[PDB]
Symmetry: D2
Subunit: 487 residues, 4 copies
């Protein structure tokens, strides 16, 4: 088992340990080779045709590079090859469990297919990791390369998802993967304290390189300016005190990428319509589970033998199906094929301090259809013809500043960690880190319906004291004069 | 129908005419959205996950740009918007007909599935264009935008494939798409005289950008240094006389891309094994054709209603199939999934002026198994365990210099065209433009079989007076001393 | 006079009109070939070795591209080749007048060498343009290519500097370069209404490409999404309504470039010390003016015959001089050569609404030396050993939002212009657009002096109720506990 | 003395050892900050404004990276930090001695200013290194960081120039810098056996990045595929056997860069004219040497105190000089300023196996003026009005294949080195590695003189049986019919 090298386009050549090569060369990992990282973005950005396989390889490589650099800079941390291999394995296998198209399954399909279950892709990745290890017989190979599987597997699971048995909430680090003195290893692959991790850097670089946008972050500079320092009696990764501006720039880059590509109108509506097609085709798609069992699309997240075959393939299954049962879903997919998409109406910005929770997402069309515009409307619409899409823009921490939970070190004292407040960096920084934006769409493709939907949406926005739409004075100029505050 | 813009990663923003938008928004074009441009290269280069949809859009955009620039530079050519739209449509719809994985279907699957038929992807693209036009009702829209479909469609077909009714061979341009004075329009999308066309530039740029290699060509400089000049009583596109070095560099870049990425050992063997899986699964895959007819994978190239659904999907059809009939093909695909690939043995270079034709491709394993090495071999192999792979490296014209069929103009006389010979450019240019290289693989994964196959291959190479393999003195050092000429 | 092409690294190939070729091939333009765009940044960023010649060529090319695109999109604007040539000439000759190192001369050297005169580089560019035209005999060539010099020269001067004879302040556009209907041509090269112009885009791209930072702006998308629309009875260039986020991103990119490269600590101190060397060497450097007159460095801005030879050369004049008169300046330059720079002390942020004006810049060291820290200091410092450096960070408009003066158009009404407020875009935008930051340096290189200067600076910051320094708890931990508000 | 980091645009962030920081922060190294790497290329490619300072830093960084990687891969080589520091210092100080504009001084100015002396820039770099060490007192610092100056300085000199005392020619490595077992350290900075070294990679990347051309080489892949293997009883750096194609591509990239940018027509003529200006201004420029001595431009290569101040500054010295003695040189420089360059005539290719040596370079204009064309010429020219420019294109080894002196290793035997012949790689490789091309220019700018010079040049080419010029049938169509072999 000789070391293997791959020519990645973002990170050049990547060297992979033989244990990593054995882990990737399994069906549970090659399943990621057929899942798009940007599901609905491929139908808006033609170049965004990259899967999660490359992203997983890159995240593993970056985690290995960061841990190797941290070990080289501070030999006193006692970082062994076992820790390097474990953090690399956590990096590669952090996205093992993803549904088709990789985001609507986790955030739109499952919440509608089965709202009772609470499912997230990290849990699916953990279960797929267990299935991979058990099915492929990886533990002998792990023991061959100096790894202790009984605790290394727990360490990898804790890296991927966090505290396994229960939330900590007591006992002062009752963890079972690594001791207290290795507390800096729970932040390399998925940092749950401030969000700065190699996963963010990798998808930043890859998405910018593929979409056609330019990236405004340099992870190598952060790597060269990061040191492990004792913070409140545990070792946390700390950055140089002059890098706070670059960290704010990283979060601004995340916000801009979400604004421009991940929350596109057409991409969001296409994801919604593919989700509707999946919901309509759920009852007639059967996936062979374990021991000959048959599983639906929505129920395949309970058996990883079936979930291994639940990839982007079901889209072309429905599209090419001749079964009359799947007719409605096939028609929806063909409407997508003809770009007969649902029509955009408008956006808004809630202004009150209270934001609408996910429990009220489906009640919005009812209120939208209840509007009573004082304009000559020749057609009356129904909530069935209205679609709302609530989007939350944040910095990884909803209401809290992610930089407020970062520790910095200076040149004079390379081992003392300090906190830098927002006002000590610049006065040209965002005053808020959470905002909400609501889209509204129409399912009809006739101009009269478009006019009626626009009037209803503008009247609804004016009713609940929402923001003035960016083009409220053109599409519906008969309602804005009523809103005195808007002018 | 307002003009639409797409954010391509290679060409930035691209503006599309409403007729183009109508042409692309059809199932026959979105079928390209699910066909990888590099079939087996995705399993060697992780980043090469780009389809033919983006490539078609880019080729159309580049054809439009080139024709617009040529029209602007020389207003006397009388280039109308009709010609621009026609060349753009030829650019977008030049790769409509591609099989799954886009290259093994055209060059490996069909020649083995049905050797009697002579099929090429240009013919399939022509038939898919006909089907698109007829099914989607494009002719009224073409007439709406000033196009004459009866001759414009013939012009587009001639652009894609060439002379439709028969080879010219007489009558001095009996063509029916465009008059003699527009002879320079048959070279923008697919140049069949010297090979310089926007298709080459687009896949150069895209493949370099995605694989991870750097490109050594600048198409914008060629565009700025190209003029239409009368050549032997027809108008041909001519380049500046100082660009001959850059053209040779373009062909060298093509050769290097073929050498490094398109002819990779692992990619070629993976394509061969997927082709074998398709051949084994042919008899049990049915695609619903026109009017309820059922078509196989190999017979779906006779009905474009069925061929519209023959994409990369059949790979995951076979892989995820529970049908016991498809068991052998499923096992082959799972062997691919486990990276239990066939093992590399060696390469060679024919030295005689006579190269082995495609008619003798399948007879090579018989001669390979017939070798009698004078070494202690404990296992005897069979031709069934041997795979050969003949690769032809050329410049687009097999034995002829492509630059020998290019006309150049100078600054003093911007309308007189001249020919530049090879010796007038440099003495550091290739003396030959055609070479052949033969790979040999083994289907067994035991070291004894590897040793036996290596000995057989080395003895076969020494028997027929072939070149000494690049590592013939290490893998098999007991045979090279016999070859006196090799040392 | 045939059209010429140059291979720029940022904009690829650039085609230049013969009038432009004649204008550039003069000493007054090649003088820019020896003036660094980033004066003190070359001694911090090794790659920033680009002059103003390339920047001028790029700005001219971008102005030509923008005007050509605007003319093509709207033929009703009646844009002739005369306007294209005039805006191009304004683009190339917008930075003709720059001092050595191009920024300290305009903003640091002249205000200290002769505070009485009010001089800016635009005035010098105007006078150099006049001198170029008169000396090289350009007017016959301008008349040869259809330009009317008597008004075209006035138009170019108005583009470079604005209203020539007097501020408008009345008469409703009494301009003498172009009529009212061409009001959109005063914004292509140097936009004085909102700051969006090709100069910003060009130095963005070039500085990012040379420093080593990545750019977060796409000017081509803005070009494709810009239209001329009547605004308050004059034609102004308007952007698409969906581009407000990208415009805010452009201003954020400007802020980040200023923060990271243009306001660097070492670069600023090196510029200050080179300015001091120039001030000390002023009295002994003579430049031959017009008619044999002799001019100093500071007085050469009154005669463009002398100013044509006042480039970055005087740095090496002083450095290599054997004249004992220039000894002090030579010693300062050699101290720069040995990197025996003045030592950094700290930075601060004024918190009061009132900012300190440039009239009080030199009075700050007096107040700094007057501090009385309650720490054991064994050495007392003087204001002569203290250097302050006030930096203003803005968006091009000091206290005003630059986007508040931009007009937008929508797809439904491509000719009606609207205003978009900040709250209608996002709640994650800066609440302020002006901030001030003050650096402090020490001229001595002994650690005791460093400690004393740090204590004095921290006490001064605590005295005037300034912000807490980002490392006030380490370099001087004995003063921060006194500031209760800081903790 | 803490480690310092610089943000290079090509290599990102570079970490520098404190000894390196002390070595660079001297006048003898900052002298490179004002010497253009491409002298005459800056007046053809506007973006090529990069000096030798960045190139030296990059070469040092790449040498350090290569040696560190080689040490990490093979711990048995016993590579200490002393060797790393020594190879880094050799990398930074490999181009210390360069004349103004960095190439015409070494290859055109000195051979004409003083043909008796044999001077090369490596000797000047060695003497500048000696002067730097002695003047700045570096030896105590070298001893502080574990370096043995008496032998380390000899090792660095041997790296820069080779055998110091005498050519080896006997004694089987009588070297005095490093023992026989460290023979692989004489190839990292300047490889004199096959030419593959970090200097080539660095200027490849930097020149491509600045000119505007795209690079076709990846040095990181070569670094990852390079191992030290015993070859003929000494340790040489060997590459992977599959990298022979990439090495040939590297040499092809060098050839293309020379063809397109380093041997440009206008750049070469501008370098020639600046050399002529220097030759005319030699007698009136005095540089203060050591102990008050005065040195000319040509005689400043005998005293490094004077040579430290001989940079690109003398160009602006001559250009801005008011001394009537320098009038002719000032006029030549102003002719350059006005782009009144000498006019191009044509190029040729010698066909005989014997090439014309440098001893006959100045005799060519005499033979050119002696031509007797059989055309109606109204003006007779003189050899004084003719300029020839002989250019040699090679692969770093004049008549020999550089890859013929490279050793390769395979995966099966990572310690046995083998030789790969050209015919074992491809049949599409150059058959010759040396070619010669001769340019001819005219000093007059009247069309009649241009016609006369073109006729004379074409007749001269036809006389000596040279190649047919690429445009011999247009500029002079009355002579080519005489040359029967040319048609
Ligand atoms: N570089 C870039 N930045 C962005 O901010 C951005 N947003 C989209 N795109 C890409 C996505 C596509 O590839 C392309 C078109 O996006 P457009 O949003 S202008 O298109 P429609 O949805 O039709 O908007 P309209 O309401 O005017 O009809 O640009 C972008 N590309
Ligand atoms: N990318 C690129 N490749 C090349 O091969 C090349 N050669 C030059 N340039 C750059 C150098 C300049 O920046 C620009 C113009 O070079 P041009 O050689 S077309 O110009 P003239 O010398 O005037 O040739 P003419 O005989 O027709 O007048 O292109 C090049 N740029
Ligand atoms: N990419 C990049 N981003 C930045 O924000 C930045 N700032 C500087 N540089 C470049 C400029 C140089 O090329 C390099 C070093 O800059 P550094 O500011 S870390 O160095 P010192 O001034 O010595 O800071 P210290 O106070 O720790 O001693 O990085 C930067 N490079």
């Amino acid at each position: 088992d000789t070391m293997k090298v791959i020519n990645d386009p973002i990170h050049g050549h990547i060297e992979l340990h033989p244990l990593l090569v054995r882990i990737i060369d399994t069906p549970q990992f090659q399943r990621l080779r057929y899942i798009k990282q940007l599901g609905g973005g491929y139908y808006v950005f033609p170049g965004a045709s990259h899967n999660r396989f490359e992203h997983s390889l890159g995240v593993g490589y970056l985690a290995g590079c960061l841990v190797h650099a941290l070990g080289e800079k501070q030999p006193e941390l006692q970082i062994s090859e076992r820790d390097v291999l474990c953090v690399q394995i956590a990096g590669l296998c952090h996205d093992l469990g993803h549904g088709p198209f990789s985001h609507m399954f986790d955030g739109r399909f499952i919440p509608l297919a089965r709202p009772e279950v609470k499912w997230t892709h990290e849990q699916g990745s953990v279960m797929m990791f267990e299935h991979l290890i058990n099915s492929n017989g990886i533990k002998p190979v792990m023991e061959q390369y100096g790894l202790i599987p009984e605790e290394d597997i727990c360490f990898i699971k804790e890296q991927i998802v966090g505290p396994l048995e229960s939330p900590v909430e007591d006992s002062l680090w009752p963890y079972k993967g690594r001791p207290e003195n290795k507390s800096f290893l729970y932040e390399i692959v998925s940092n749950k304290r401030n969000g700065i991790d190699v996963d963010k850097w990798d998808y930043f670089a890859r998405d910018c390189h593929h979409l056609g946008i330019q990236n405004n972050f340099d992870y190598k500079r952060f790597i060269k300016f990061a040191r492990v320092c004792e913070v409140d009696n545990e070792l946390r990764i700390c950055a140089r005190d002059k890098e706070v501006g670059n960290l704010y720039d990283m979060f601004h880059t995340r916000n801009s990428l979400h604004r421009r590509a991940y929350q596109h109108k057409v991409g969001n509506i296409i994801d919604t319509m593919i989700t509707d097609a999946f919901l309509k085709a759920d009852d007639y798609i059967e996936i062979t589970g374990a021991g000959g069992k048959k599983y639906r699309i929505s129920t395949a997240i309970d058996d990883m033998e079936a979930y291994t075959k639940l990839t982007d393939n079901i889209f072309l299954e429905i599209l090419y199906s001749t079964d009359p049962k799947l007719k409605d879903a096939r028609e929806i997919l063909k409407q997508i094929e003809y770009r007969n998409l649902f029509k955009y109406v408008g956006e808004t910005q809630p202004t009150g301090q209270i934001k609408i929770k996910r429990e009220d997402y489906e009640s919005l069309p009812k209120e939208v259809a209840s509007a009573k515009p004082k304009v000559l409307l020749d057609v009356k619409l129904k909530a069935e013809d209205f679609i709302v899409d609530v989007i939350n823009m944040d910095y990884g921490m909803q209401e809290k500043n992610p930089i407020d939970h970062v520790s910095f070190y200076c040149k004079t004292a390379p081992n003392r960690a300090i906190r830098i407040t927002k006002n000590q960096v610049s006065q040209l920084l965002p005053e808020k880190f959470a905002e909400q934006l609501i889209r509204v769409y129409c399912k009809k493709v006739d101009r009269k319906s478009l006019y009626a939907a626009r009037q209803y949406f503008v009247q609804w926005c004016a009713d609940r004291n929402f923001t003035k739409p960016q083009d409220g004075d053109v599409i519906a100029p008969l309602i804005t004069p009523q809103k005195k505050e808007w002018n």
